[model samples]
Target chain A: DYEILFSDETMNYADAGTYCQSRGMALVSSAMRDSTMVKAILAFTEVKGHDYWVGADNLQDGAYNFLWNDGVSLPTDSDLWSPNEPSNPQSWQLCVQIWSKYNLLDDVGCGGARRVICEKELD
Target chain B: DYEILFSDETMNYADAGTYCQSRGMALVSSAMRDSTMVKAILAFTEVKGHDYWVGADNLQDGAYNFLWNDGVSLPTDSDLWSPNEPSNPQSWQLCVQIWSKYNLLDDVGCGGARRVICEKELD
Candidate 1:
């Protein structure tokens, strides 16, 4: 039902998201939230410094409740956030990233140089 | 198919802010995946800290444009910002902060110690 593409080049959050959208996808969303999928992603990213962007954001200096780039609400769980994670005191923590190191998550600024995993769900 | 690779240590806006950049990332921005990213930052201090920073500037003395440190103008949410926040640098010093004291939004001294959230792009 789905195909995910890992970007080989580097791009910011916006460029990566738009690149995915150009392919009828978006950066990985919680819409793709699944343990098997998480494992699948981890299998690839668990290296020294390979990571990708998660296209979601609240985009402000306010509360926490990041939505998908397209504004889809995400799910929550212990596995969802790393412990004491998302300790954002700055509003710059606008976008998200998923890593393979421990298969955990973190919030980051969109301006940071990062890659992305694009998801395509088919009919 | 994605998972987290790393979560960074706690640092101040400038401290952790520079950390991500030194490691080849700017702060988190508007270009990330939401659901997964929500967890990335949530993995940090969990808002139990004094406050934090993200990105974007309300303005030098006005509300015409809100820009990210990466120099991107917003589709912006300045509307959420002012009860008349920032009040101009003459009125306030330092940068942005998600004020935990009142559980609202505002700016504060950049010297304040708080957990920082960092981001990077994969090579």
Candidate 2:
């Protein structure tokens, strides 16, 4: 079984990940690579009307080189980014979010508080 | 006499302001308007090597219309700004800081933790 869950509370990127792992899930990453899943997730977020922390970030490889928790590289020019987004001035913004304004990904400071998205797999 | 104070610790913009107020001071703004004071503040920040929150932001008048905490206007075209700064996409960045990179003011997200600069008056 596959499941995607949204949190009731908001947290910074690090705590969002911990929240997911505590629930036997992880911050959503695999689903981000699938267009079909992306559409569904975005549809849910549209109704929820909140920015969400995803599992992808550039903390390891530096700016514009985001990596999902599943070890997948998110291309710098990927359509996932909102217009003029991932624009990290001085590399201060290192975390990704599904921005409520564009419903697309944006690079934000990691300390920013946002709702969480989690993914789970079970037999 | 006018005094400019730098905090030894760091905090978010809101808390930073409160910290200054707690000590009978306010976040530094008057100094921002004076060229001589500006030079001195930047020199101190350069040696400290940390981003420090100032008293100017667009929180009241909205994006690109920053005002000092003392109600003085900060012109958008002012030379005090670092290159391409005050770039608030979606108006999320509402606070100003002395960017360590350029040693000039830059708009930043208010939630970011930065060292504090405060102003005080003495008889």
Candidate 3:
């Protein structure tokens, strides 16, 4: 069901997942791995020029070991990350966002408000 | 269930509708009325710089009176339309599209190939 929904509002990482969950969805993850889907999503974000909270974080094990909400590892060597991204060493920078500057993924504080991308898989 | 899905593939009006239908969705309609939702949709299209098939069309009445797939009329005076749109006098120009040039509604040939925007309402 690869349906992607972009929210008009912004929320922090935790609330972002809650918002999507309340609607029977979850913060987008697998879709981001699809080249076409990610490109289209990046185009949408490029229009706003604002960072967006996605569904990956290092809160599980830390040390830059990130995993998507779908439980897939987002390797440190993944090309999806912007240059020098996942750069922050602070524990608070465990959540991830699509950095506007590069339209690529970046780790940031979970409390930072950012646009949300939600997805639902229909049965 | 205000979920919107932007397709990576392009197709004619009929196939576009069919594609969404097969996915248990429909060509986007009501969401177009929402300022925030429409803005996001337009922003996505703006990035691709390509026209996209929406759910409104004048096929039922033959005049410039367009109705959305949800059975709602799309008023000609609505600001969503590009200036001087619904201009084609030809009967084939019954379908509506988000004209890439203006990022607004425009009448077009139903068979014209364009991208699709699909939406689903969860029960």
Window of ten residues with lowest summed lDDT in model 2 chain A: A1-10
> Candidate 3 lDDT, tens digit per residue, B73-116?
99989999998997888465599999988989999888879888
Clashing pairs in 3: none
DockQ per candidate, 2 decimals: 0.02, 0.01, 0.26
- The residue-level lDDT of candidate 1 at A33 comes to 71
Q: For candidate 1, lDDT tens digit of each residue in B44-117?
A: 22323336566544444335354566676533344334355655454444456545554333555556665443
**Stronger candidate by DockQ (1 vs 3):** 3
Which stretches of candidate 3 lie above 4 Å from their native place?
A: A121-123, B1-52, B59-61, B66-93, B98-123
Q: Report the number of clashing residue pairs per model.
A: 56, 0, 0
Task: Please list the C-alpha lDDT of all candidates, in the order they appear.
Answer: 0.54, 0.78, 0.83
What's the iRMSD of model 3? Answer: 5.0
Give per-residue CA lDDT, model 2, range A1-123, as digits (tens): 234555546789999999789857799898778765566567656655579899999889786888998889988899999999878763665889999998899988899899788876434
Candidate 2's displacement at residue A53, Å, is 51
Report the Cα lDDT for candidate 3: 0.83
Worst 10-residue lDDT window, candidate 2 chain B: B1-10
TM-score of 2: 0.48
Best by lDDT: 3
Per-residue CA lDDT of model 1 for A1-123, tens digit only, reads 344555546688888888778856668874347555555455545532466677766674234677776666553334666565565655455676775444567666778677677765544
